[PDB]
């Protein structure tokens, strides 16, 4: 960081999304390249853009403190880095579809697209949604 | 070399060098080199340190030289016996008391000044110390 208040700024940046959280999308890609992360972001770049917040400050004392205001379900997974791909209009969106693209391209790891906040399921497929 | 133009007396005493310095204050520049030691400065040494400092800044900043030698210590032609008067004047030296600011410089950053003053530090015959210009 540059300041602890900047670390607190990263904390409040996370709560702006948690106040608008509708679902939960996880990606535990520990081994990735800049263009690897960019190939996923161009898919996000032409669907929405930067709107799909990818604020990765997933420490047990960082992300866990920035979630309990609303949708406390992701606090149980908390740490062990999660590349969050969530947007404001994410309620039943094409976010689950963006991870199957990564499992076939360059990434053998993407947390196997689990989904925790209200998909009414787990690791298994999510295709039947008003998307 | 720094020599007094039209001196009144050609040769003076070797005297003594004691007491704490006079020029403790730094006002012209912002960063200056101070002499924590006590010794003597030859003419060639001050001209060597002027050239070894004008190299690093490459025509930036403003360099000041606080002291002027103004005292000709002498040497005699070797193999001569003692007596017959004092020798011929060879070079000019300034006596330095502890706490005397030698150089002053501004128009340079704080980081570059600390490094360039190390160049002249090894060119002078006594102990060095780096300080900065403070109000009061």
């Amino acid at each position: 960081m540059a300041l602890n208040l900047q670390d607190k700024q990263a904390i409040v940046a996370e709560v702006s999304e948690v106040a608008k959280g509708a679902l939960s999308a996880v990606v535990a890609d520990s081994r990735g390249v800049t263009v690897d992360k960019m190939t996923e972001l161009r898919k996000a770049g032409r669907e929405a853009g930067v709107y799909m917040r990818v604020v990765r400050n997933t420490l047990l004392r960082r992300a866990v403190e920035g979630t309990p205001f609303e949708c406390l379900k992701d606090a149980f997974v908390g740490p062990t880095l999660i590349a969050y791909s969530m947007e404001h209009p994410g309620a039943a969106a094409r976010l689950f579809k963006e991870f199957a693209k990564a499992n076939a391209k360059f990434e053998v790891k993407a947390a196997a697209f689990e989904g925790e906040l209200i998909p009414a399921s787990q690791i298994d497929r999510l295709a039947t949604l008003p998307t | 070399m720094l020599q007094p133009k039209r001196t009144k007396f050609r040769k003076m005493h070797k005297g003594r060098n004691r007491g704490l310095a006079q020029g403790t204050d730094v006002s012209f520049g912002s960063f200056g080199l101070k002499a924590v030691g006590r010794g003597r400065l030859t003419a060639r040494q001050i001209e060597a340190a002027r050239r070894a400092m004008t190299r690093a800044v490459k025509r930036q900043g403003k360099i000041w030289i606080r002291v002027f030698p103004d005292k000709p210590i002498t040497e005699k032609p070797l193999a001569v016996r003692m007596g017959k008067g004092k020798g011929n004047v060879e070079y000019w030296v300034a006596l330095i008391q502890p706490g005397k600011v030698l150089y002053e410089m501004d128009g340079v950053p704080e980081e570059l000044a600390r490094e360039a003053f190390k160049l002249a530090a090894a060119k002078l015959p006594i102990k060095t110390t780096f300080v900065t210009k403070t109000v009061m």
Partner: protein, 94 residues
């Protein structure tokens, strides 16, 4: 914020000043107004780190001297010539 818990001096002079300056505490004196000049003792170590803050000069000091608290201003700074330490600072009673 510039408050210094200070003590007064029982002795003074050339050697007496060096006697306590070696005990890591330098002398100072406050003059001004119409009252009596007060030779005050104060620890050395704290001030060198306090004068590092540039606002130390321009702002009004608020040190205390045995009960009565007097607001002061710094007048003179007598630094030791070659060694990086202080010896004597003058206080304008302001």
């Amino acid at each position: 914020m510039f408050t210094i818990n200070a003590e007064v001096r029982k002795e003074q002079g050339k050697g007496a000043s060096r006697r306590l300056r070696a005990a890591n505490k330098f002398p100072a004196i406050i003059y001004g107004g119409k009252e009596a000049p007060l030779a005050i003792e104060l620890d050395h170590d704290k001030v060198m780190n306090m004068q590092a803050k540039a606002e130390f000069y321009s702002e009004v000091l608020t040190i205390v001297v045995d009960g009565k608290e007097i607001k002061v201003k710094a007048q003179d700074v007598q630094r030791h010539p070659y060694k990086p330490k202080l010896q004597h600072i003058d206080f304008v009673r302001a």
